Design a protein around this nucleic acid. Sequence first.
RNA 1: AAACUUUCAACAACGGAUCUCUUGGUUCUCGCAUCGAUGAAGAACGCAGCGAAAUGCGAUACGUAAUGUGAAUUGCAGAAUUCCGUGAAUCAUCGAAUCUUUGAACGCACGCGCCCCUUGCCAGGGGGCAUGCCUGUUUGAGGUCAUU
Length: 131
Amino acid sequence: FITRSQAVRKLFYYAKDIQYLMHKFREHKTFARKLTRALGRGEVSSAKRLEELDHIIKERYPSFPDAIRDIDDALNMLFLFSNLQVSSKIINDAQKICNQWLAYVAKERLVRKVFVSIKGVYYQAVRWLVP
RNA sequence: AAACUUUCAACAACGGAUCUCUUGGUUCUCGCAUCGAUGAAGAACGCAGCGAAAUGCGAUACGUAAUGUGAAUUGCAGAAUUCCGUGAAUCAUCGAAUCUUUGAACGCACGCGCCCCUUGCCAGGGGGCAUGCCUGUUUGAGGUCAUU
């Protein structure tokens, strides 16, 4: 069997289900060198012109109910960031997402269990936590 | 004498010489430019029911695809055909396919490796990986200049 390091370099796992999986993140690296070239040129207009995961979601979760498997960690991370070198815009977006989720939950009032704890106020709809 | 040597008329054998002819050769004149990595010429193996040569064909193998003709092919068997019909010919045209192994011959050589993928540790199935050079994209390394 191909080792994890060897498989990653080529791209313990089954080779049958990994070889076919070899098929914009790599292309984005060119933007760094283009920006460096623009900086070297000393003009910012070209830099401004240069400046101007749905696919993975479906395969991981082919159906909406399947999202519940990872929704625990998803909500945990989102709520942790909502209260936390992360940019302020990322924090604001995470807080807005959590606020919208809470508003929708309150609209339907789909809550069954709660538990105030030292770690945080636990909740159940699916279980989720907020600090 | 018979037998046997020799000249000649007739009869009986060789060979195709003479005569007649040819889907032939040679020579003259006229129109055109038409080989090849999108794989040339050439060589080997197979293909028709029966097959020596020639021609055609490449496991779709004396052919497959398409149009015209309209009732065949023929040495033998065999097929039919609704033949008033989108339909037979070993017919003609031929623009669409297949195109075995070699061969400029092209994975590495003087047997024999790799990407791919697939339908079921492992495999069938399908295309490629030769060298010289031109344009473009990607990565890596090294000389100049800048670095308050």
